[PDB]
């Protein structure tokens, strides 16, 4: 899904696929967290849990 | 216009 | 809280104060709706009812 690799400071997964390039939208179970919100742009929640 | 590239899992 | 009117098109409440001039932030139980989101600028929910 997405996490900052604390050694290399490089994202991965669906967050890292659109921060770093090759995606325009991420319609997927991407939980709204603070460390993701600083780099990507979430909608309002379509599902609560 | 271009095709928007969804990335699901 | 805030709503339009089909006569004078005027927001009446806490959304009325943000749109026009009379406020800067409206920390309060405003429910994130579509008709408010077009004219004001909400945040990720703090309270899931």
Swiss-Prot record, chains A, C:
<feature type="binding site">
    <location>
        <position position="29"/>
    </location>
    <ligand>
        <name>L-glutamate</name>
    </ligand>
</feature>
<feature type="binding site">
    <location>
        <position position="31"/>
    </location>
    <ligand>
        <name>L-glutamate</name>
    </ligand>
</feature>
<feature type="binding site">
    <location>
        <position position="36"/>
    </location>
    <ligand>
        <name>L-glutamate</name>
    </ligand>
</feature>
<protein>
    <recommendedName>
        <fullName>Glutamate receptor 2</fullName>
    </recommendedName>
</protein>
<feature type="site" description="Interaction with the cone snail toxin Con-ikot-ikot">
    <location>
        <position position="4"/>
    </location>
</feature>
<comment type="subunit">
    <text>Homotetramer or heterotetramer of pore-forming glutamate receptor subunits. Tetramers may be formed by the dimerization of dimers. May interact with MPP4. Forms a ternary complex with GRIP1 and CSPG4. Interacts with ATAD1 in an ATP-dependent manner. ATAD1-catalyzed ATP hydrolysis disrupts binding to ATAD1 and to GRIP1 and leads to AMPAR complex disassembly. Interacts with GRIP2. Interacts with GRIP1. Interacts with NSF via its C-terminus. Interacts with CACNG2, PICK1 and GRIP2. Interacts with GRIA1 and SYNDIG1. Part of a complex containing GRIA2, NSF and NAPA and/or NAPB.</text>
</comment>
<comment type="function">
    <text>Ionotropic glutamate receptor that functions as a ligand-gated cation channel, gated by L-glutamate and glutamatergic agonists such as alpha-amino-3-hydroxy-5-methyl-4-isoxazolepropionic acid (AMPA), quisqualic acid, and kainic acid. L-glutamate acts as an excitatory neurotransmitter at many synapses in the central nervous system and plays an important role in fast excitatory synaptic transmission.</text>
</comment>
<comment type="similarity">
    <text>Belongs to the glutamate-gated ion channel (TC 1.A.10.1) family. GRIA2 subfamily.</text>
</comment>
